[PDB]
Amino acid sequence: SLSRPRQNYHAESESGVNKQINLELYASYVYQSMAWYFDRDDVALKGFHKFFKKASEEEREHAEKLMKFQNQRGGRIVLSDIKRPDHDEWGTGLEAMEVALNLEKNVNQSLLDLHKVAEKNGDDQMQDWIESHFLTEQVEAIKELSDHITNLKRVGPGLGEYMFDKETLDGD
Amino acid sequence: SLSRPRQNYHAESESGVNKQINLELYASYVYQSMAWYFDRDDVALKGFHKFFKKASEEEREHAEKLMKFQNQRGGRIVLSDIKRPDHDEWGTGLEAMEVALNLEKNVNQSLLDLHKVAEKNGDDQMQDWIESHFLTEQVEAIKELSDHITNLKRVGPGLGEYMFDKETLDGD
Amino acid sequence: SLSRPRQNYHAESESGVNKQINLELYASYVYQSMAWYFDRDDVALKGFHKFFKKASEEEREHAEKLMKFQNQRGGRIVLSDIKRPDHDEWGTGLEAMEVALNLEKNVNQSLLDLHKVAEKNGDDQMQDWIESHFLTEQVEAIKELSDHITNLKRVGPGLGEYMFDKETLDGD
Amino acid sequence: SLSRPRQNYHAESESGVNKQINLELYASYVYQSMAWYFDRDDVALKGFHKFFKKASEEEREHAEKLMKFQNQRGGRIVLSDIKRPDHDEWGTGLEAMEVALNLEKNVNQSLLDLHKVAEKNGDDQMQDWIESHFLTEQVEAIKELSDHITNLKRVGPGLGEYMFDKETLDGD
Amino acid sequence: SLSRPRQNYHAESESGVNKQINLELYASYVYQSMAWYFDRDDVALKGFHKFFKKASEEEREHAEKLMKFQNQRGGRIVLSDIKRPDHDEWGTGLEAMEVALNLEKNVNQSLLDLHKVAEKNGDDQMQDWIESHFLTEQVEAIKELSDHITNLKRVGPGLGEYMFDKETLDGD
Amino acid sequence: SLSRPRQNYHAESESGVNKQINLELYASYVYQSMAWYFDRDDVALKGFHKFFKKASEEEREHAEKLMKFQNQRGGRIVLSDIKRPDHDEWGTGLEAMEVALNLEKNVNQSLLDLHKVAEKNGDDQMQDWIESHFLTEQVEAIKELSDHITNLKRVGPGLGEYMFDKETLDGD
Ligand SMILES: [Mg+2]
Ligand SMILES: [Mg+2]
Ligand SMILES: [Mg+2]
Ligand SMILES: [Mg+2]
Ligand SMILES: [Mg+2]
Ligand SMILES: [Mg+2]
Ligand SMILES: [Mg+2]
Ligand SMILES: [Mg+2]
Ligand SMILES: [Mg+2]
Ligand SMILES: [Mg+2]
Ligand SMILES: [Mg+2]
Ligand SMILES: [Mg+2]
Ligand SMILES: [Mg+2]
Ligand SMILES: [Mg+2]
Ligand SMILES: [Mg+2]
Ligand SMILES: [Mg+2]
């Protein structure tokens, strides 16, 4: 029995939105782990803390954008376990930014794959929605992380990392 | 002799925009009929009146969005009779909301069909225009009507219908 | 079974209000056709566009004044097809103003005929209502269109039409 | 090698804070599931939606209070999988409030158990911290849910549930 | 060695963005030539001057939108000579507006061709970006130039051209 | 047939102004290339980006100052191809500032050479105009670039370049 709103919305698209929901929540958890790693007394970079804390809140917003979309189209949210991140510790500011870029590139591919499911099933509204909410925001996030990685390599460790935290990440 | 602006704009697309203009004007007329039905002394629901009056004005705005688009692309507006609605009377608030949802789903399909004409003829700008102006607005309208139908069934007839008119539709 | 409000309201008057509703909606559609004709890239007169767009919205307001009146007196709105206008194209600014005047004079007669139905059936309130809402507004509209026609003949075609659009119709 | 801040902070307390972090994140996920269930077109209670959405954000704040505390005391955050909730669907507003109360009572016990670990290990600051941040907030949350359950039983299903959503939960 | 941001970005798309950069800069130079032609003591139309000066600045902004896009996607800007325009002199206001429309239609085709390269290579983000930034803006620019050409033919040479400069182009 | 304004304005001066127009536009293009090089994900210096972007806009303003001057004196603007810059890549912040200084010194000589043409032909107004608009502005630009080069050598590569971008160029 099809939900009352449902029109031009395919079971593969509905299932793909649930898979993207879990990935956004997973990315939220990775950024949360990194945020609180930078609050450790033996790491102590408030800029990096604030940056990954905000990244974590944004990913949970992405998850909730997809939950609202699922309900708009008359699909049904199915939640899965949010897997713990692969590491308890995240190294230097540079190493954490590289992990961030690799995560954002994996989320980007997964969004393009979900756009392909929409396209395969003739879902013109879902393709446009993914384009409006996600595809350009992911390009912007990937360029920003690439800029940060270039600058963290330019400033180098020690004082450089500290000044990057103060200047680019507005630490404090 | 092609109009001065005309570029990548197919006769099938031009004709499809005229057909969508008439459908938007038709939907405007159905909502107008329902609006003034709720102003009857023997129906007397100001919330429902205000809701369908606004829906009617929006559909005429949709019609005028398509008239402006036709002229932008160098096509020519051709108007047809606006058929009277299928009923003089529209029953209960619940029955009118169900008629609304069925109308919005028929307008939605017709917009996806017009997007398919654009796509078939390689009209990338017209596909994006339909996506920006219509496809997401239709999804939102269909979800809102589905929410209203669920709530009108929850509150039930009599006092429930009255309180829905006061609370959700801000009657008065 | 007479509606609860109904007092001194004759079946001929009720039927005449439904006929005037359709005529107001028809006039609305003619003005809408002319409005969007003046938005064509090959006509391109923003003053004329704005003038007929406003005329169109006013005629739909007239239609809704009569719908409210029908319900006030305990009559029942019966909607008919809104016939498409007699032309797709409307010529020069002067030619469109002459079509406007001829339409307003036909709506005026039809209002005087409806006033005669009210009078024949002793409906003192309906005669006064038509006088308050319509008869003087029609005289004003006819005088304004006659003034515009005189001025469009004075300024002549080409630059004159352009300056009339800028000065009298406040184009832009 | 003990972290630089660490003083009077026992391995059992550190491990108990990580277990409470996962429970707060779990409760956050249950409230998130319930929030978006109430946004379904076939459930459509904006008050319940807003209430569980806020409850979800608060539980994630609780999780982050414990992450900050772990780092303050020189312990180390260890994250585990956030288990999916036990249900995809949550029934009536009344049924969801009862699930909420049962969850808050299980989180409450778990906080008293964590306070007992602190007490067993002579951690006077950690006992006071749990008292300041959690023990009274849990009593308040449990009393509020008990009040809501009493009122949802008083108003009854259908119109009652709708009016509770409008009046007590400020729906819209 | 692929740049750090690069994902789903094809060499044909990168090369097409460099070709569109040069075309936008070329169009900027044509509008600049026309702007300063209208500042000649023997042409002296401040409205036309201001209009083509703004058109020139906008085209250079288009060029810079594509430079930012190239860098966002991890491609590399390659600049070519900006060819001088085909004429030193641009005739009447009407003749310059017709040259403008022909230029905007050639830039429009070139944007649709670049969208086709994006589409051929499955670049969903680049297609949406071209749609958001360019395809509708080009339709609007072409309709405006078509409107101006219609009006410059309506007003005729001499006084008409002067009044068009004062009224539509706000000369001074 | 001499233009109506022309007085004491020599063909050599008119031709020299057209040559300076092309040089200013060339310098604009070099600064634009350098601006967008500093926006590359693998260069990523917002201060340098903003500095060369502004330098580029100023050089195009210089070009337009000379176009206005040509028309004031009754000469005729003749535009040539704007040659692409000699490099796609511009190295370190220090290397780009040295390229800037060398460009500004070549533009300076070319302005003194144009002043000599004015002087040779007794054009007292054109000599004063070049003095007022250009000769002191070039001295100021050359001193500023020399100061920046001294400071980029003082701070050294890596962190020094980053801090120069933040402090002297107000990056962000
Ligand atoms: Mg995300
Ligand atoms: Mg794809
Ligand atoms: Mg699209
Ligand atoms: Mg868009
Ligand atoms: Mg519509
Ligand atoms: Mg389709
Ligand atoms: Mg009327
Ligand atoms: Mg009479
Ligand atoms: Mg009176
Ligand atoms: Mg909690
Ligand atoms: Mg105890
Ligand atoms: Mg352009
Ligand atoms: Mg195409
Ligand atoms: Mg210069
Ligand atoms: Mg000298
Ligand atoms: Mg001097």
Residue numbers in the entry:
A (entry chain A), B (entry chain A), C (entry chain A), D (entry chain A), E (entry chain A), F (entry chain A): 2 to 173
Published text:
For marine invertebrates with no adaptive immune system, ferritin is a major intracellular iron‐storage protein with a critical role in innate immunity. Here, we present the crystal structures of two novel ferritins [Fer147 and Phascolosoma esculenta ferritin (PeFer)] from the marine invertebrate P. esculenta, which resides in muddy‐bottom coastal regions. Fer147 and PeFer exhibit the 4‐3‐2 symmetry of cage‐like hollow shells containing 24 subunits, similar to other known ferritins. Fer147 and PeFer contain both the conserved ferroxidase center and threefold channels.
However, the marked variation in the electrostatic potential of the threefold channels in Fer147 and the fourfold channels in PeFer suggests significant diversity between Fer147 and PeFer in terms of metal ion aggregation and cation exclusion.
